[PDB]
Amino acid sequence: DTVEGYTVFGPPKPGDSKAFLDIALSIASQNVSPTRVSVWDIKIPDMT
Protein backbone atom coordinates (compact mmCIF):
# COMPACT_ATOMS: atom_id res chain seq x y z
CA ASP A 1 0.00 0.00 0.00
CA THR A 2 2.80 2.42 0.88
CA VAL A 3 4.20 2.76 -2.65
CA GLU A 4 1.56 1.28 -4.94
CA GLY A 5 -1.64 1.52 -2.91
CA TYR A 6 -1.43 5.23 -2.16
CA THR A 7 -3.18 7.55 -4.62
CA VAL A 8 -3.94 11.26 -4.51
CA PHE A 9 -7.56 10.62 -5.50
CA GLY A 10 -9.94 10.03 -2.61
CA PRO A 11 -13.40 8.51 -2.26
CA PRO A 12 -16.25 10.52 -3.78
CA LYS A 13 -17.96 13.02 -1.52
CA PRO A 14 -21.74 12.80 -1.06
CA GLY A 15 -23.80 14.39 -3.79
CA ASP A 16 -21.10 13.94 -6.43
CA SER A 17 -23.19 11.98 -8.99
CA LYS A 18 -20.05 10.06 -9.90
CA ALA A 19 -21.13 7.26 -7.56
CA PHE A 20 -24.20 6.86 -9.77
CA LEU A 21 -22.27 6.60 -13.03
CA ASP A 22 -22.16 2.89 -14.02
CA ILE A 23 -25.55 2.65 -12.38
CA ALA A 24 -26.69 4.96 -15.16
CA LEU A 25 -24.75 2.96 -17.74
CA SER A 26 -26.63 -0.22 -16.81
CA ILE A 27 -29.92 1.70 -16.85
CA ALA A 28 -29.00 3.33 -20.17
CA SER A 29 -30.76 1.76 -23.16
CA GLN A 30 -30.56 3.13 -26.69
CA ASN A 31 -33.63 4.91 -28.05
CA VAL A 32 -35.16 4.10 -31.43
CA SER A 33 -35.76 7.78 -32.31
CA PRO A 34 -38.50 7.14 -34.90
CA THR A 35 -39.11 9.29 -37.95
CA ARG A 36 -41.80 11.95 -37.58
CA VAL A 37 -43.92 13.72 -40.17
CA SER A 38 -42.10 16.85 -41.34
CA VAL A 39 -43.53 20.05 -39.87
CA TRP A 40 -44.05 21.32 -43.42
CA ASP A 41 -46.57 18.51 -43.95
CA ILE A 42 -48.77 19.20 -40.91
CA LYS A 43 -51.43 21.81 -41.67
CA ILE A 44 -51.93 24.46 -38.99
CA PRO A 45 -55.41 24.08 -37.47
CA ASP A 46 -57.93 26.82 -38.22
CA MET A 47 -59.35 28.25 -35.00
CA THR A 48 -61.69 30.72 -36.74
How close are the terminal C-alpha atoms of the chain, in Å? 78
- Would you say 12 and 18 are in contact if contact means Cβ atoms under 8 Å apart? yes
Cα-based angle 28, 29, 32 (whole degrees, multiple of 5) = 140
CB atoms within 10 A of CB 13: 8
- Would you say 12 and 19 are in contact if contact means Cβ atoms under 8 Å apart? yes
Spatial CA neighbour of 12 closest among 3, 27, 23, 26: 23
d(CA 24, CA 44): 40
The resolution of the experimental structure, rounded to one decimal in Å, is 2.7
3-state secondary structure of 35: coil
**C-alpha to C-alpha distances, 41 to 2, 17, 36, 44, nearest whole angstrom:** 69, 43, 10, 9
